[PDB]
Amino acid sequence: SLVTTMCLLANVTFPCAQPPICYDRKPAETLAMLSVNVDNPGYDELLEAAVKCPGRKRR
């Protein structure tokens, strides 16, 4: 089968592209999460997603 790219948070797995939250909500947690996924090939996907800004806006 094809494999999606998975990243780790806690003892849970999730798509690297789609983490549950971002930097603005909790900066410490986000960085910690990024550090945990340093080894993973998906890491850059995770960095991009974690780093981008929020939903409450028109554009």
Cα 43 from Cα 26, distance rounded (Å): 19
The SS3 of residue 31 is: helix
Determination technique used: cryo-EM
Q: Tell me if 30 sits within 8 A of 21, measured CB to CB.
A: yes
Q: Per-domain residue ranges for the chain?
A: 4-53
Resolution in A: 4.8
CA dihedral 14, 15, 16, 17 (to 10 degrees): -140
Cα 20 from Cα 9, distance rounded (Å): 10
What 6-10 contacts at long range (C-beta under 8 Å, 24+ apart), as own/partner pairs, is 6/40, 6/42, 7/37, 7/40, 7/42, 7/43, 7/45, 7/46, 8/36, 8/37, 8/40, 9/33, 9/36
First-residue to last-residue Cα distance in the chain: 37
